[PDB]
Write a protein that binds this ligand. Structure first.
Ligand SMILES: *[C@@H]1O[C@H](CO)[C@@H](O[C@@H]2O[C@H](CO)[C@@H](O[C@@H]3O[C@H](CO[C@H]4O[C@H](CO[C@H]5O[C@H](CO)[C@@H](O)[C@H](O)[C@@H]5O)[C@@H](O)[C@H](O[C@H]5O[C@H](CO)[C@@H](O)[C@H](O)[C@@H]5O[C@H]5O[C@H](CO)[C@@H](O)[C@H](O)[C@@H]5O)[C@@H]4O)[C@@H](O)[C@H](O[C@H]4O[C@H](CO)[C@@H](O)[C@H](O)[C@@H]4O[C@H]4O[C@H](CO)[C@@H](O)[C@H](O)[C@@H]4O)[C@@H]3O)[C@H](O)[C@H]2NC(C)=O)[C@H](O)[C@H]1NC(C)=O
Ligand SMILES: N#Cc1cc(Cl)cc(COC(=O)N2C[C@@H]3CN(C(=O)c4ccc5[nH]nnc5c4)C[C@@H]3C2)c1
Ligand SMILES: [Ca+2]
Ligand code: NA
Ligand code: NA
Ligand SMILES: [Zn+2]
Length: 806
């Protein structure tokens, strides 16, 4: 019950949402239906429209009008946005030349430049170029300010997951808004787009920017706007808030446009009908900026123009049906569309089997336009698993397609030509970022970045301390003229041991053999030098990785590679090596095919053993530093050391061998040398963070050798590829991946073909940021370069996406 008998008199768009059953006057009461009886009459005035005309100039104040053109309207903070233009011979903001804003030019009583977040739904990154002719205000913001060619959303690329990521700097898995429809089994409750469950606080985790602001004494405008409040009114409200007294006036504000998403769904992203929504958005921008200029705030406020996601061509005819794959379709519940999530229809049916559902959906038709995954097997770059609202079975749908349970769900539940929600690497899902204002750079382009990073920067812009989030604070300092955040590198927690020769070969009883007893002060002073670290400057180019947790490990040097060898996990945490453009691939000599050699620097009790592999019929082994890339026949023996071995399913050894025998050399040829760091990852609880030893669910049978869930590689080179990787004077270039360590290649539908037709495509799918590998290993990379730490942070957040050029 809301006793709506109170009144909005003097309270229109009041900033504290007062508790029931007193009636409300805030920008959300319509959506809750709790507004006072007189909310429309007093707060949603429309009379005379939104623009001054010549005849209203000077007019006598009439409180009925939507906005005013009377002499006192500036004092009142409620002029029409074009008042000064029509009535006082001023220019529109867009017609003025841009002039660098080197310092904030703020009215008296402003303690900090306000932040206005101008968010647009469904604003595809390519609109900036393709719509440029009809968006002059936006184009001015973009060219005069700081802009990225695009900004990457999170997955799933739906509205609420992305807006609330923008507000919290968290992945959906962590904030808890994981889709537009959700079931939470603990609450036993469902969340939906239409309805009232979605207004319950328990859905929404983290700390959004308006709460961060409030808890630190910065006031905030209310971020949300009911759909029936017109855009003009939203802008006038913001500008009226900006006229409040100092102690009552917010520092941060948001506007939201439901366009161009609304039209995009109906017409497609580039439908002829899409010109007018772009024009209308631009006009709204124009109203804000003319309004700010009237208040003398246009060289004071920092404006961010930001989208939530793009929009792709999707029609009813490109639907796949689960009824064409499964016979028991009535026993499942599907969350459908541009992604799928499947769970059992009833918890009391113990005949439902996830394994057989996945098998029925795997590679069943030649052109199949979705791929099923257990959530923990999704690409790690999606960070889409650690939440109980994410069902175990997920379908990743190809761009331009839908998935549905049965045809009747699509014809009785075509209406639409656009949609979004797909993999956040897809070009059509990318969206926009422009920053304009005293705190942003002038006429600067920056590289694409992910939306998880913007919370930190908004916090910076407002003088706030960010709550703990998934951005990397400092990676976006290059967007800012001032207020940078100057982070320090984390402290190394564990120092390495540097073992020398300590064990005789007969101490080892590992069941390992090698044909290596076929043996000179010349080249034996030489191998002693390689074992003390003499080639290490060539193979460890950016310092040793720091270990950021408590553990016991050894640095091992060799001619061709350096490793950090964990005595706890019995294998390297990391292995580092450099492959020049000139390096040659060699094969594994026949007599060395099964060679494994004890490492006399490491005790038997801290070594793997060959017998465990012999007795584990499921599990084989691989090497981190590849024997194929050995610099010499004699150096090759180092690669067969038991301290360079790692457990690998035979099916995974197909991928890994191709990476090591063919791809590495191809990259070194293309990039003018590469530095490679590779290692294992253990993430059995799928939280994106390094497991402790007591979380490992699988060991090589009979042993304490833990089986990795993933293998990584970080591949670094010179951004200026006319310089070789090992003699680079400036910025670096990186690509990385996090390959799932699976006992089958069911993910790859073409895996019975030659590796040259499928392996690299798998690796592309599992592209990763260095930061993602950091979380997964407790390691910190690039500790010693000649670059600024901020530039390194940016390199660590880079994702190589392998899409074509937008
Ligand atoms: C991306 O960034 C995020 C944010 O930094 C990273 O996520 C963080 O990761 C930490 C490790 O996984 C995790 O620490 C947890 O915290 C547990 C307490 O959590 C509750 O309180 C949180 C704090 O709120 C307050 O925050 C500020 C200060 O920062 C205060 O001033 C305010 O007053 C705030 O109220 C809160 O954030 C958290 O929210 C989650 O849960 C809510 C529902 O309960 C959701 O609404 C919300 O969306 C969050 O949901 C996500 O996270 C949970 C895990 O918390 C997960 O279940 C969901 O799937 C979803 O992903 C909570 O309300 C604390 O209890 C944990 O401690 C245990 O572990 C330590 C290990 O050292 C033990 O020593 C200790 O004994 C304890 O063990 C006991 O429990 C075990 C397991 O239950 C049990 O086995 C054992 O035997 C013991 O009984 C731990 O510290 C942060 O909570 C988490 N934050 C968020 C927001 O998600 C994330 O990792 C990043 N991702 C990547 C890839 O880097
Ligand atoms: N997060 C975030 C965020 C980040 C940025 Cl950058 C911009 C914005 C501006 O978004 C809005 O104006 N929106 C208005 C639309 C309709 N709507 C609701 O009615 C609603 C939804 C959740 C609620 N929880 N509690 N009340 C709620 C009301 C939500 C939609 C989005 C939000
Ligand atoms: Ca983990
Ligand atoms: Na052998
Ligand atoms: Na396959
Ligand atoms: Zn939409």
């Amino acid at each position: 019950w809301t006793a709506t008998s109170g009144s909005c008199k003097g309270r229109c768009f009041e900033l504290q949402e007062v508790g029931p059953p007193d009636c409300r006057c805030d920008n959300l009461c319509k959506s809750y239906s709790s507004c006072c009886h007189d909310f429309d009459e007093l707060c949603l005035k429309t009379a005379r429209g939104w623009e001054c005309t010549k005849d209203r100039c000077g007019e006598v104040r009439n409180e009925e009008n939507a906005c005013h053109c009377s002499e006192d309207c500036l004092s009142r903070g409620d002029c029409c946005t074009n008042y000064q233009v029509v009535c006082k011979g001023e220019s529109h903001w867009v017609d003025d030349d841009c002039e660098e804003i080197k310092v904030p030019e703020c009215p008296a009583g402003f303690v900090r430049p306000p932040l206005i977040i101008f968010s647009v739904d469904g604003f595809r990154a390519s609109y900036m170029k393709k719509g440029s002719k009809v968006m002059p205000n936006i184009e001015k913001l973009r060219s005069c300010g700081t802009h990225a060619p695009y900004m990457r959303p999170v997955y799933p690329t739906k509205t609420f997951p992305n807006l609330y990521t923008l507000a919290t700097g968290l992945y959906p898995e962590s904030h808890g808004i994981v889709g537009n429809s959700m079931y939470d089994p603990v609450f036993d409750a469902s969340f939906h787009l239409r309805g009232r469950e979605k207004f319950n606080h328990r859905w929404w985790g983290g700390q959004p920017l308006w709460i961060t602001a409030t808890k630190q004494g910065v006031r905030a405008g209310t971020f949300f706007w009911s759909v029936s409040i017109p855009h003009e009114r939203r802008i006038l409200t913001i500008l009226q808030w900006l006229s409040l007294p100092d102690n009552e006036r917010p520092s941060v504000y948001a506007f939201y446009s439901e366009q161009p998403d609304f039209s995009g769904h109906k017409y497609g992203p580039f439908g002829p009908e899409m010109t007018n929504p772009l024009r209308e958005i631009d006009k709204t921008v124009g109203q804000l900026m003319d309004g700010l200029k009237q208040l003398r705030l246009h060289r004071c406020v920092n404006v961010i123009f930001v989208g939530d996601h793009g929009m792709e061509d999707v029609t009813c005819d490109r639907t796949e049906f689960l009824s064409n794959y499964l016979t028991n379709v009535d026993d499942i519940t599907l969350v459908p569309g541009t992604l799928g999530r499947i769970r059992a229809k009833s918890i009391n049916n113990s005949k439902y089997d996830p394994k057989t559902i996945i098998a029925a959906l795997t590679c069943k038709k030649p052109d199949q336009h979705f791929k099923p995954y257990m959530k923990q097997h999704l690409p790690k770059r999606l960070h889409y698993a650690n939440n109980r609202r994410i069902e175990d079975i997920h379908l990743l749908v190809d761009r331009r397609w839908h998935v549905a349970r049965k045809p009747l769900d699509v014809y009785k539940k075509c209406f639409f030509q656009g949609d979004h929600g797909f993999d956040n690497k897809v070009n059509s899902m990318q969206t926009v970022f422009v920053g304009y204002g005293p705190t942003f750079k002038y006429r600067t382009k920056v590289p694409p970045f992910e939306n998880i990073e913007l919370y930190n920067v908004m916090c910076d812009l407002l003088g706030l301390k960010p709550a703990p989030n998934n951005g990397t604070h400092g990676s976006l300092n290059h967007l800012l003229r001032t207020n940078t955040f100057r982070p320090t590198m984390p402290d190394e927690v564990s120092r390495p041991n540097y073992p020398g020769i300590m064990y005789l070969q007969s101490e080892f009883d590992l069941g390992c053999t090698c044909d290596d007893k076929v043996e000179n002060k010349l080249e034996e002073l030489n191998k002693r030098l390689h074992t003390k670290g003499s080639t290490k400057e060539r193979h460890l180019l950016y310092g040793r990785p720091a270990v950021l947790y408590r553990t016991s490990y050894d640095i091992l040097y060799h001619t061709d590679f350096e490793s950090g060898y964990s005595e706890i996990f019995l294998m390297p945490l990391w292995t580092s090596y450099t492959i020049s453009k000139q390096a040659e691939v060699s094969s594994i000599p026949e007599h060395l095919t099964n060679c494994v050699r004890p490492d006399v620097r490491v005790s038997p009790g801290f070594s793997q053993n060959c017998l465990a592999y012999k007795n584990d019929k499921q599990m084989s082994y691989g090497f981190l530093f590849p024997p194929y890339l050995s610099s010499s026949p004699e150096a090759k023996y180092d690669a067969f050391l038991v301290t360079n071995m790692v457990p690998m399913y035979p099916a995974f050894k197909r991928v890994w061998a191709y990476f090591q025998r063919v791809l590495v050399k191809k990259y070194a040829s293309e990039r003018n040398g590469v530095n490679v760091i590779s290692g294992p990852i253990f993430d059995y609880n799928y939280d994106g963070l390094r497991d402790t030893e007591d979380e490992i669910k699988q060991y090589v049978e009979g042993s304490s050798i833990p089986v990795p869930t993933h293998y990584y590689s970080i591949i670094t080179s010179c951004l200026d590829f006319t310089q070789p990787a090992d003699k680079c004077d400036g910025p670096l270039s990186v690509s990385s991946f996090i390959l799932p360590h699976r006992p089958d290649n069911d993910e790859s539908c073409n895996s019975s073909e030659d590796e040259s037709k499928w392996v690299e495509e798998l690796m592309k799918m599992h592209t990763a940021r260095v930061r993602d590998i950091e979380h997964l290993t407790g390691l910190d990379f690039y500790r010693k370069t000649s670059r600024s730490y901020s530039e390194i942070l940016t390199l660590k957040t880079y994702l190589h996406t392998y899409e074509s050029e937008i």
